[PDB]
Amino acid sequence: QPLTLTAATTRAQELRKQLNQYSHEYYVKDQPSVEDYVYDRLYKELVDIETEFPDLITPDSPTQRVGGKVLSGFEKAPHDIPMYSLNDGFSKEDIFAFDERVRKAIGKPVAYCCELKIDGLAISLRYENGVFVRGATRGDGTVGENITENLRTVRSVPMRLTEPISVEVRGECYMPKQSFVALNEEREENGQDIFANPRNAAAGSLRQLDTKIVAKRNLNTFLYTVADFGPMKAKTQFEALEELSAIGFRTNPERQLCQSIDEVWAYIEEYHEKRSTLPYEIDGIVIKVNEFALQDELGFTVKAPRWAIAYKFPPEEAETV
Ligand SMILES: NC(=O)c1ccc[n+]([C@@H]2O[C@H](COP(=O)([O-])OP(=O)(O)OC[C@H]3O[C@@H](n4cnc5c(N)ncnc54)[C@H](O)[C@@H]3O)[C@@H](O)[C@H]2O)c1
């Protein structure tokens, strides 16, 4: 073990503080001081040390936490069903290793429902008898910020479902490139810190206390998770996407159900190219175990599901100069 117990402990402490500090600025202030990959590199090191010396994992470690503390100002939005993060992949190997773990837990190969990781803000919508009653941010996974109002200024968010059914679903809220571009040119004239990336613009907007502003910003959505099914009958993630659409939610069409891990990778390769042709920023791919009975079997860890993995994409910005 290249690292000695002392070297890893001290390193894990440095890493824990440094990373925690950065999370606070990124979630609790939507004003990060470091690039996302700088954070990711450091985060990845912590994970390696924690994996090499599990005895060093502490409750305060960022590996044990999701998102961040709620931005006071708004009303607290407890989550009846917890929200999480996802485990990341940065190589074809990671994708294959993930498949390898799954196969070992299921005992056979499984088909994956692949989707584009829409780069925006995480949201949760609550419906009671077809009526939109609450919209929330992910927060720290157990308590978000109530942003129902703000969310009602968004066209795609349906006010009443197609059936007077009660359900809870999650998805993403974003700002198309088209508008990110525009908005900024405007803010510049108003001498305001033009938004860094489409992600922070959306987050900066939705977490704005004055809906008056929010309304004019122009955001869209994509729903991809059913938290509380109510009377929904889908047994697979691929079906749930159809059902979510069918009851009135906007859902992303690029999804593809893959029967082999080779197909998953090709899907990843594919959209990594088409990327530019899309009107919305995507920060990767989300590979999901299609069968729900199986997702239940795999379960979650303190921070993320075992039945999914997110292949990360550097922002096209960094692939285009
Ligand atoms: N620069 C910094 O200081 C700093 C600090 C903290 C975190 N970060 C960044 O935050 C991110 C990690 O936080 P994260 O919890 O979002 O981890 P993650 O990037 O692995 O995220 C998954 C999230 O993506 C979303 N998503 C989009 N499309 C989806 C789909 N089809 N299916 C399922 N989910 C979908 C969900 O909202 C979900 O919470 C990284 O990009 C990291 O670099 C940066």
Side-chain angles (χ1 to χ4, degrees):
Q1 199 48 279
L3 234 49
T4 67
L5 197 284
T6 299
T9 305
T10 56
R11 189 51 178 156
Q13 182 131 304
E14 287 182 295
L15 292 176
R16 271 196 297 287
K17 196 169 76 172
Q18 184 163 52
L19 287 158
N20 277 328
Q21 230 322 78
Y22 300 143
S23 271
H24 193 66
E25 321 180 313
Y26 184 89
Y27 294 110
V28 174
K29 299 169 57 187
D30 290 307
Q31 196 169 59
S33 77
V34 291
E35 220 83 5
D36 284 355
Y37 76 91
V38 170
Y39 175 89
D40 298 329
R41 196 201 294 298
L42 286 171
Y43 181 81
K44 168 59 187 170
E45 185 175 355
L46 177 60
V47 177
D48 287 327
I49 298 183
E50 281 190 3
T51 298
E52 300 171 304
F53 309 71
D55 187 60
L56 305 180
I57 303 179
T58 74
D60 64 303
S61 170
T63 66
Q64 311 300 292
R65 312 157 80 175
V66 341
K69 307 179 182 304
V70 166
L71 196 62
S72 169
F74 297 71
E75 186 190 0
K76 288 180 185 174
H79 295 293
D80 11 50
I81 302 170
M83 283 181 89
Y84 301 83
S85 180
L86 290 171
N87 291 311
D88 297 342
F90 299 87
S91 62
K92 181 174 187 170
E93 179 165 351
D94 294 328
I95 294 310
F96 270 56
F98 160 76
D99 176 80
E100 181 167 59
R101 283 191 290 288
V102 175
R103 293 193 67 173
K104 273 187 181 177
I106 297 315
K108 66 185 178 192
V110 309
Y112 302 93
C113 176
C114 296
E115 311 172 19
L116 309 178
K117 189 181 189 296
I118 306 303
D119 187 37
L121 186 76
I123 52 162
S124 185
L125 316 179
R126 186 181 294 172
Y127 286 82
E128 310 186 316
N129 286 127
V131 172
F132 176 48
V133 297
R134 201 193 66 162
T137 55
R138 186 180 64 176
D140 70 3
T142 67
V143 184
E145 301 149 295
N146 192 148
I147 53 170
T148 317
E149 250 62 293
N150 275 38
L151 278 171
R152 271 166 188 152
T153 77
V154 187
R155 247 306 176 185
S156 52
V157 176
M159 292 303 91
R160 266 183 281 293
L161 306 179
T162 65
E163 242 83 7
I165 70 177
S166 301
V167 299
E168 294 190 296
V169 304
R170 292 72 192 279
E172 204 87 352
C173 182
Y174 59 106
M175 186 179 309
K177 299 165 170 190
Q178 175 88 72
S179 305
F180 177 83
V181 175
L183 174 52
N184 275 317
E185 66 77 58
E186 159 181 346
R187 300 182 61 62
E188 225 304 299
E189 305 186 66
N190 286 299
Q192 300 167 297
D193 316 358
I194 61 177
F195 291 96
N197 56 54
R199 169 236 128 61
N200 281 295
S205 300
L206 274 177
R207 300 177 63 175
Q208 178 72 183
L209 290 156
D210 179 54
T211 79
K212 299 290 190 298
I213 317 181
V214 188
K216 283 177 291 191
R217 285 295 178 66
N218 182 59
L219 315 165
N220 210 325
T221 54
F222 278 128
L223 282 295
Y224 40 67
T225 302
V226 178
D228 189 350
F229 283 71
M232 287 173 83
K233 61 283 157 50
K235 294 184 182 175
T236 64
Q237 169 66 190
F238 196 84
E239 295 181 318
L241 289 170
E242 289 169 352
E243 198 164 352
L244 278 173
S245 216
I247 58 178
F249 295 102
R250 180 165 183 280
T251 70
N252 200 106
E254 310 305 339
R255 72 212 173 190
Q256 195 194 308
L257 179 47
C258 303
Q259 301 303 319
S260 84
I261 191 59
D262 278 352
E263 280 191 346
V264 180
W265 182 251
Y267 179 86
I268 291 178
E269 287 283 53
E270 186 184 313
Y271 285 89
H272 186 101
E273 308 297 291
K274 301 188 172 184
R275 194 182 193 181
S276 61
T277 77
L278 303 178
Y280 49 88
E281 289 291 357
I282 70 183
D283 71 307
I285 310 300
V286 178
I287 294 60
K288 299 172 180 166
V289 168
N290 190 45
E291 223 183 309
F292 289 149
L294 301 176
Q295 290 189 185
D296 292 333
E297 207 175 313
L298 291 156
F300 303 70
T301 71
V302 60
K303 183 192 185 79
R306 288 198 183 73
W307 47 268
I309 182 171
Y311 189 100
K312 287 311 210 74
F313 280 176
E316 43 174 53
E317 192 84 306
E319 285 170 345
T320 183
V321 183

